[PDB]
Symmetry: C5
Subunit: 45 residues, 5 copies
């Protein structure tokens, strides 16, 4: 029973998931950077 078809589908699913992770990660970096900047300008510090 040839399993290559199914294996290809798993690999494509991997890239689909990874692309989601990358997009979530780059937005997360923006949120952390905003957080950093807000703290710096925090007079209390």
């Amino acid at each position: 029973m040839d399993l290559a078809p199914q294996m290809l589908r798993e690999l494509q699913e991997t890239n689909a998931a990874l692309q989601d992770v990358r997009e979530l990660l780059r937005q997360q970096v923006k949120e952390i950077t905003f957080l950093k900047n807000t703290v710096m300008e925090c007079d209390a510090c």
Copy 2:
């Protein structure tokens, strides 16, 4: 011993793990986003 069956199984396992990593990141990004807003509206700042 055609290892396609075992290979396929590892791939399927990789995706299951990645699905979980993605869901975890989504909730994490949400928590961080909430934190950003809070600090921005911080009186002491």
Copy 3:
């Protein structure tokens, strides 16, 4: 020589590393959710 066994080995190691990432992430989210709860009750804000 046949490179299939080597390939399966790389896949097994990929999943091992992926499983570690999941545990770390799982823990990270908790530390963050904790940080959030603390900031929510910061008397400075």
Copy 4:
């Protein structure tokens, strides 16, 4: 060979995606360490 070409293409794309994820995390750690030291060096605290 059959689907081999497409499989190899998915693997390369996964790699490129990983490269970016890695680059983003290295920046994210830098931002977290800064934020860390900033709060650690906050008069208010």
Copy 5:
């Protein structure tokens, strides 16, 4: 046989990148835990 050589190369590249990610997350969780302990002790809160 087959594009096994090129495919294996991409997987080794994948695992090497992944191992770096685990280590980056390793350090990152530590930093977060440190920030958490720091905010928990902030006298401003």
